């Protein structure tokens, strides 16, 4: 005879990080809409992070991003076509540069979503990080209109908060879009509007930067007669509201008591 209620061999049981879970859900939501996920580098060139996105130097708009500037010789930053890119190095302040890289390397129409680690020089508190994640979206092609951007986010909301969810758009500014907009989604349970992210129609100067860099690389122009929309949303804020995580600082804390709590979560 054997006691069957006796503990068995202590085989280890793994788990996924909250951010990996939230990012996966977001990526799934958009895959169902035809978006494909691709990634960019965490260490970027000012050209891709700012200049190519219509964000000058000593431009008031630069202030919307507190940047970590890097230094050191011997580092090789490869451009979209594997080339050796140059320019002052920094930690990307957002995933947006990736939409420039992708466009020089591909041709419309397409739908991409690019999750990624981003960095801002900031003070770490209960709802603020210097190291966090964003999910960028970019859909370009003949006839793409703001009505489609709104449709996308409407689908994001429904997919995230159920049939009783709603979306709200208000004009807001971004050097890389025009019209520009901020969007919030209605969260029926918490009974409140959540400011989710920014978006808009890709700015004319962005398409121009893309086709200039293409020509400078021998590629033919590809974004002359197309339009598109782009959006960007913070992951931690969403992960927090979705898992009831009180301190944004727990994500990079590494505390098992914390991480372990998400083994169930799919």
């Amino acid at each position: 005879r054997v006691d069957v209620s006796l503990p068995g061999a202590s085989l280890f049981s793994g788990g996924l990080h909250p951010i990996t879970l939230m990012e996966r859900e977001l990526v799934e939501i958009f895959r169902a809409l035809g978006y494909q996920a691709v990634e960019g580098p965490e260490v970027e060139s000012e050209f891709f992070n700012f200049d190519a996105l219509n964000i000058p130097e000593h431009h008031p708009a630069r202030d919307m991003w507190d940047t970590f500037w890097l230094t050191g010789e011997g580092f090789r930053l490869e451009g979209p076509l594997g080339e050796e890119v140059e320019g002052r190095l920094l930690l990307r302040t957002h995933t947006s540069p990736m939409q420039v890289r992708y466009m020089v390397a591909h041709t419309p129409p397409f739908r991409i979503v690019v999750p990624g680690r981003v960095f801002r020089f900031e003070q770490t508190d209960a709802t603020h990080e210097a190291v966090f994640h964003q999910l960028e979206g970019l859909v370009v092609g003949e006839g793409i209109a703001m009505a489609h951007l709104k449709g996308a986010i409407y689908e994001l909301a429904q997919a995230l908060f159920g049939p009783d969810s709603k979306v709200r758009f208000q004009p807001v500014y971004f050097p890389f879009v025009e019209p520009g907009a901020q969007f919030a989604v209605w969260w029926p349970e918490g009974g409140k509007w959540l400011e989710l992210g920014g978006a808009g129609m890709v700015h004319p100067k962005v398409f121009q930067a893309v086709d200039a860099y293409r020509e400078r690389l021998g590629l033919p122009p590809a974004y002359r007669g197309v339009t598109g929309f782009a959006f960007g949303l913070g992951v931690e804020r969403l992960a927090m509201l979705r898992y009831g995580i009180p301190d944004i600082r727990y994500f990079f804390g590494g505390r098992l008591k914390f991480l372990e709590q998400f083994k169930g979560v799919l």
């Binding site: 068995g8 061999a9 085989l11």
Partner: peptide, 14 residues
């Protein structure tokens, strides 16, 4: 037995 109960405990922990 306990090897199986082991793997199973992991499954549900997972």
């Amino acid at each position: 037995y306990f090897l199986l109960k082991g793997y199973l405990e992991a499954l549900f922990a997972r």
